């Protein structure tokens, strides 16, 4: 085959294809694809079912061509055969991911062409004792901030002394900082 390895793509979404796409694969290929993205992120990828096409598996349903997506511990596929046979989206829970098509000798068909999107890792909403949270949403994202501001007759403790109100962002690793502060009824 050619040399397609060694790419890495680092934006937001992006887009990659088969060589040669939609013109055959070419047999022999060791094609790797790295995905990079900053810690909070999950990459995403979106692949139509009509935009796969791989040589079918063998009778004994292994893949002679086959594309692999890796993440960590986690790895989506094998993929072969007519039409992709996973999801239209798969979230890979990683910021980091592997894609991996190798092909053998004979029979190629046209490939495949995928999108990728990064999506902000979540934060869990606590639940809000006596306190209330602005801005309220159903879901908290990598980067949010929330203000969070204690009913009357609460205050926090460890922030500042003789506060009744803080702000709290979501991080990448899916917590919120001042976790520790919570609203407390005032001696
Ligand atoms: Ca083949």
């Known amino acids: 085959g050619v040399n397609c390895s060694g790419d890495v ?67 989506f596929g094998p993929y072969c055969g007519h039409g992709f046979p996973g999801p239209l989206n798969i979230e890979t829970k990683s ?33 809000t004792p006596n306190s209330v ?6 879901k908290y994202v990598f980067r949010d901030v929330v203000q969070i501001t204690c009913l009357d007759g609460f205050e926090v403790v460890e922030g500042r002394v003789g506060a009744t109100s803080f702000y709290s962002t979501c991080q990448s690793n899916g917590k919120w900082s001042n976790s520790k502060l919570k609203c407390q009824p005032v001696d």
């Open 9 to 75: 793509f680092t934006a937001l979404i992006g887009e990659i294809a088969s060589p040669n796409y939609p013109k055959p694969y070419p047999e022999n290929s060791r094609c790797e694809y790295q995905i990079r993205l900053e810690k909070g992120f999950q990459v995403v990828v979106t692949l139509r079912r009509e935009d796969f096409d791989v040589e079918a598996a063998d009778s004994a349903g292994n893949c002679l061509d086959s594309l692999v997506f890796v993440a960590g511990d986690r790895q």
């Open 95 to 127: 910021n980091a991911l592997d894609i991996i098509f190798q092909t053998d000798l004979t029979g190629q068909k046209k490939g495949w062409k995928l999108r990728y999107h990064g999506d902000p890792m979540p934060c869990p909403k606590e639940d």
């Open 133 to 138: 949270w602005e801005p309220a949403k159903a």
